[PDB]
Design a protein around this ligand. Structure first.
Ligand SMILES: CCCS(=O)(=O)N[C@H]1C[C@@H](N(C)c2ncnc3[nH]ccc23)C1
Length: 281
């Protein structure tokens, strides 16, 4: 049930790619008649096998309505992670195609669902470290799920954070000051990334309004080396992503509470759930 044979995983197309990992759409077809189920397969790009094993162990341990469902594994010396496939794809793919169909009420319900999924992940003592719209999957127009855990780490025992020893290519434009200045990741650091994801969601994932595009227009291009320093300085000055068009004051105030410079001053996911639900009538 949880073991998928590689020869029967018929490649269809790519769903997404990282630096060292890729997610592909496959049809698991053991009958050879093309009636098999479509699944999302995460593997290693052409090791790092230990990190995919950790991700598998994390996802197998998560059971929640707003978290992509683990289905099993496929072995090669190598390993692949098998997950349910959500045909509507990420919010980055879905929102620009459905701008007219999705109103503020629906966006706020997605924000509650992501916070519920994140609060559940935090209760398991994990930090996601990669919360962005590209990682939020659309199950239906009424439901979303957190769909990738490639950077997820277990919080160091009796500590409030995880210290990254690598961070090779990480989503710096979604990162809190403590991640950028000290490589320390708190549950509060995910709260900051959430505020950035909420900003993406409210702009319908418009590429011109993306966190990278906006910050590249605020700071200016330098590439690779000085980007993080110039981002830290911009954040120290009190500059934040602006209020999206048609975002009400009440929603922006919640978003701004995700963006307090100090981790201890930020709102929690439980407070965000209650705050958004109070706006839903
Ligand atoms: C290492 C690559 C990270 S990434 O590319 O930034 N995001 C992931 C691609 C995936 N995604 C769009 C999916 N689309 C459809 N069904 C799905 N099930 C499970 C996943 C998934 C999330």
């Amino acid at each position: 049930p949880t073991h998928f044979e590689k020869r029967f995983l018929k490649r269809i197309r790519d769903l997404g790619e990282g630096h060292f990992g890729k997610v592909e759409l496959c049809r698991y077809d053991p009958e050879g008649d093309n009636t098999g189920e479509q699944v999302a397969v995460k593997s290693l790009k052409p090791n790092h096998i230990a990190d995919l094993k950790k991700e598998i162990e994390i996802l197998r341990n998560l059971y929640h309505e707003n978290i992509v469902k683990y289905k099993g594994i496929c072995t090669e010396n190598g390993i692949k992670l098998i997950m349910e496939f959500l045909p509507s794809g990420s919010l980055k793919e879905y929102l620009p195609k459905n701008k007219n169909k999705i109103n503020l009420k629906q966006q706020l319900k997605y924000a509650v669902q992501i916070c519920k999924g994140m609060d559940y992940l935090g209760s398991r003592q994990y930090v996601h470290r990669d919360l962005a719209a590209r990682n939020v999957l659309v199950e239906s127009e009424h439901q979303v799920k957190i769909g990738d855990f490639g950077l997820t780490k277990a919080i160091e025992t009796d500590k409030e954070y995880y210290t990254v020893k690598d961070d090779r290519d990480s989503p710096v434009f979604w990162y809190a000051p403590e991640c950028l200045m000290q490589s320390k990741f708190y549950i509060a650091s995910d709260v900051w990334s959430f505020g950035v994801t909420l900003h993406e969601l409210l702009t319908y994932c418009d590429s011109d309004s993306s966190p990278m595009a906006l910050f590249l227009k605020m700071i200016g291009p330098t590439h690779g080396q000085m980007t993080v320093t110039r981002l830290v300085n911009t954040l120290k000055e009190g500059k934040r992503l602006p209020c999206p068009p048609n975002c009400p004051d009440e929603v922006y105030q919640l978003m701004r509470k995700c963006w307090e410079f100090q981790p201890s001053n930020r709102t929690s996911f439980q407070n965000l759930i209650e705050g958004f639900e109070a706006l839903l009538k």
